[PDB]
Symmetry: D2
Subunit: 237 residues, 4 copies
C-alpha cells in the first residue's frame, strides 16, 4: 500500500468508519480515520480557503479552513513527518462523491517546500502557484474524473454539462515534479500549502469532500476509494 | 515597560537569576526567565545558524540553532502571540557582554512576515534579507555599541581594532519599518526569521549571549541591561 | 531639488507642458516631460493593474498597465539608474487632481528589490506587499491628502464622505523604510513594483493621474505640484 | 529538430562555426551561431555565477557572468520569446567536452517563472532552488554523462575518480516538471535563472563550455552534439 498523509475537509459524516456526526476537518496519517478532527460548518455555494502548515522544528502539522465573513475551523496534530513519510514524494488534491454528491472545485492551489541544512545557506526550495488551471496543464498529473480548463478552474470530481455534480465520482491532481520533503542533514524541513474551493451541492446532503495529500511518487487512486474513502485509501481500516 | 518576546542564545549561565547551569537557548515572554529552554553546546569560533518560526494556526513558537557538521539545539513553546505583543512592532537583534565577554557577530539576517486574511487573496507581506552589512545601513536602526561595515558584517557588541571583544558592552539592531505582526481579521499570521553568527571568546567563559527579539516600535535599550540582561530587560525578575 | 524617476499614468493631456494629445503612460527621468510615452485608453470605473520592472543588466525600465478584458499599454526606456538615482531612496505612489478631477484610488501595492553582488551569494533584498491598507499604517508615510482605511483602501487625493473626488488635491504614500536601490559591488540590481487602481471620474475629463515613483529619502511634495505636475516636480521644465 | 533557446558560456573559440576568436558569452536562438556575444575573461579554478533574466514587457533577454574579483561579462538581445518558444518547455543545463576538455561543475542552480495575466491578482508561478544535489535527485532528469551526489555537486560531463575531466563528453540536466513559460492571456511572462559553476582545466585550452537552455519538453541530446555543439545542437548551422 501507499503511504498517505492528508488534511481532509469532510462534508459527509460516515460514522461507521469513525467520522464524527458533523461535517469536519481532520488530519489523516495512513488511515481514513483521522488522528484529529474539528467540527466544520461549511457554507454551501461559497468560496472557502484552506491553509496547511508544517515545520520540522515544532513538529506540529496544522490546518485552518475559512470563508469570507466568517467562521473558521482549526485542527492541529503533533507529529514528526521524518518518521511517517518517505524522503521523496508527490503532493496532490483528491475528491470523491458517493451515493451523495457535490461539486468539488479548485479555484487556486499553491505549495512551498523548504529544506534548510546545517551548512550555509544552504536552501533547497520548490514553490508553485496556480491561480488558475488551463485546459492542457502539463505540470499537473490528473487522475480519474479530474479535469481542468472549465471556467479556468479545476474539477476534481465529474461534473455534467449543466454544472451538476455526479455520484460515485473520484478524481485527483498531483504536481508533476517529485518534492524532496525531508533530508537527514536538513535542520529545517518545512512546507506551506494553500487552496481555494467551491463546494456546491443540490440535495440536503453533500458528499464526500476534498483533501490535500502527500504520498509516494508513484501513488495512484486505490480501488473502491470513491465516496467515503475520498480517493486516498483502499480500506476504511 | 516594553513588551518583549525573545529567543535567547545564552552563553553564560547566570543561575541566581534562574538560568540552567549550561549554555542554553530559551524562549522569553516578557521576562529574562525563559519559559522554555534547551541545552546548547556552543562551538567556539564557528559560524552558527538560528531558525526562528511561528504561525498563528499551530500557535507554537519554535527555535533551532545549528552548526555545519551536525549538532543542533531545539526549543519550542506553545503560545498565542495575539495576546502578548501589540499589533504593530519592530524586530531586531541584541547582544551583551558582562564581566565575561565574547564577540557577538552577525553575518546574515533575514525576516518574513505574512498576514493572510479571510478575504481573497489577500496577503500583506514584509520580507527583508541581509547577506552583508555596509558602513551606513539606512534600513537598520543601530543602538548602543552596535556598528556595521567591518568585514561587511554587523557587530552587536563593541570590538577593538585588533578584533578583540569588550566587556560591559551592549548593542542592538532593529529593522527600520514597523511590522504588522497580527490583525484581528487575519486568519493566518506567520513569521520566520533566520540569522548566521560567529561567537568567539578568549577566556574560558563567553558571555552573555545573542537574542532575536520583537518589541514595541519605540523600544530602546533598558538602563543597565548589559551582561546577563542581554540588553532586553530592565530587571532580572 | 529632489531627484525623481517615475512611471506616470496620465489621465489628462496637458499639451502646453509637452504631453501627447491622449491619455498616456510615460517614463519620466527628473522631469514632468516624459522621456517616453505610449497611448493609453483608460476604462472609467474599472480596476487596472500596473506592472513596473527594472534590471541593471539589460538596463531597461519597463512599465505596463492592463485591465480585465485584456487591453493594455506598454512603455520601455533604456536607462542605467546607477547614474540617475541616489544609492538610497524611498519608493511610493503620488496622485493629483487639477481643475478637473477623479478618484485616485489604490487597492494593492507590492515592491521587490534585490542586490546580488559578485560574492556568494550574496543577496540583500526587500519585499513588501499590501493587498489592503489598515486605518493607521505604520509602515507607510502619508503626505498631502493621502489617507487609508474605510473600505480598506488608500485614497491618494481628497475624497468626500459621499465618495466624490476633489480638485487641486495632492497626496503621496511612501514606504517607511529607505530602500537600497543599487551598489557599486552589485553585479545585478533589480526591482519590481506592481499596483492596482480604480480611477472614477464624474466629469467627461478625469485628471490629472497616478504615479509610481522613486525619490531621495527626505523627498516631500514640492510646492504647487497639484494638477498637471502630478505631485512630483516643482516646475514644468 | 528541437527548438532551443540558450545562454552559452563558451570556453573554446571554434571560429569556423561562427565563434569570435576569444572565449565568450552568447545568446543563441535555435542556432549554434549566437545572435549576440560578449568577450569573457574566465578565471580557471574559480567559482563564477550566471544571472539570466527575461520579461515580456521589455522583451530583452539578458545574461551576466561574474566572478568574485568583481570582473564580469554582460550580453543582451532584444527578442519576443512568445513567437520563438512553445507554450510549455523544459529548462536545463548542458555541458560538453571536445578534443579539449574541462570540468563542467554546478554548485547551485535556481529558476523562477511567473505568468501575470490581466485577470487582476491571478499569478501562476514556479520556483525551484538547488543549493546542493543529492545522489538520486528525482526532480532532475539526467542525460548523457550528467551525474550527482558525492560532494553534492552536479558534474555535467564525465570526470574520473581522481577529479580529472574527460574528452568527447556531453551531459544535460533538466528540471522534472514542464514549465509554462508563457500564455496568450498573460500581460507579464518572465523568468530568472541563476547558477554557480566551477570550470577547471589542466591543459592550456579548456572546452567546450556550459549553457542554460529552454527547449521542447521531450527534448534530448542531439546525435554528435559534443564538443563545439555544446550538447544543444545537431549541427553547426
Ligand atoms: C443512506 O446512505 C448510507 O447508506 C447507503 C446504503 O448502504 C450507503 O450507500 C451510503 O454510503 C455510500 O454513499 C456515501 C455518501 O456519498 C459515501 O460516503 C459512501 O462511501 C458510500 O458510497 C451510506 O452509508
Ligand atoms: C564571573 O564573575 C561572577 O561574579 C561577579 C560577581 O562577583 C559577577 O559580576 C559576574 O557577572 C557579571 O559578569 C557576567 C558574565 O559576563 C554578566 O552576565 C553579569 O551580568 C555581570 O556583568 C559573575 O556572576
Ligand atoms: C479647462 O481646464 C484647462 O484650462 C484651464 C484654463 O486655462 C486651466 O486652468 C486648467 O488647468 C487645471 O486643470 C488641468 C487639468 O486637470 C490641470 O492639468 C492643471 O494643472 C490645472 O489643475 C486646464 O488646463
Ligand atoms: C586542435 O584542436 C582543433 O583541431 C582539431 C582537428 O585537427 C579539432 O578536432 C578540434 O575540435 C575538436 O575539439 C574541440 C575542442 O574540444 C571541440 O570543440 C570540437 O567539437 C572537436 O571535438 C579543434 O578544432
Ligand atoms: Ca466521510
Ligand atoms: Ca545568562
Ligand atoms: Ca497631464
Ligand atoms: Ca565553441
Ligand atoms: Mn472524516
Ligand atoms: Mn537564559
Ligand atoms: Mn504626461
Ligand atoms: Mn560560441
Amino acid at each position: 500500500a501507499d503511504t498517505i498523509v492528508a488534511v481532509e475537509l469532510d462534508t459527509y459524516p460516515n460514522t461507521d468508519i469513525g467520522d464524527p456526526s458533523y461535517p469536519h476537518i481532520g488530519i489523516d496519517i495512513k488511515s481514513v480515520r483521522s488522528k484529529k478532527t474539528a467540527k466544520w460548518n461549511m457554507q454551501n455555494g461559497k468560496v472557502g480557503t484552506a491553509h496547511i502548515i508544517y515545520n520540522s522544528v515544532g513538529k506540529r502539522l496544522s490546518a485552518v479552513v475559512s470563508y469570507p465573513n466568517g467562521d473558521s475551523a482549526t485542527v492541529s496534530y503533533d507529529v514528526d513527518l521524518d518518521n511517517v513519510l518517505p524522503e521523496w514524494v508527490r503532493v496532490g488534491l483528491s475528491a470523491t462523491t458517493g451515493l451523495y454528491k457535490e461539486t468539488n472545485t479548485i479555484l487556486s492551489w499553491s505549495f512551498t517546500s523548504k529544506l534548510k541544512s546545517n551548512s550555509t545557506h544552504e536552501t533547497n526550495a520548490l514553490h508553485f502557484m496556480f491561480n488558475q488551471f488551463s485546459k492542457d496543464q502539463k505540470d499537473l498529473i490528473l487522475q480519474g474524473d479530474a479535469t481542468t480548463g472549465r471556467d479556468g478552474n479545476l474539477e476534481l470530481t465529474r461534473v455534467s454539462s449543466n454544472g451538476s455534480p455526479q455520484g460515485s465520482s473520484v478524481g485527483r491532481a498531483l504536481f508533476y515534479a517529485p518534492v524532496h520533503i525531508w533530508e537527514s542533514s536538513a535542520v529545517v524541513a518545512s512546507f506551506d500549502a494553500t487552496f481555494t474551493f467551491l463546494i456546491k451541492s443540490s440535495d440536503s446532503h453533500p458528499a464526500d469532500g476534498i483533501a490535500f495529500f502527500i504520498s509516494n511518487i508513484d501513488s495512484s487512486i486505490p480501488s473502491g476509494s470513491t465516496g467515503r474513502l475520498l480517493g486516498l485509501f483502499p480500506d476504511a481500516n
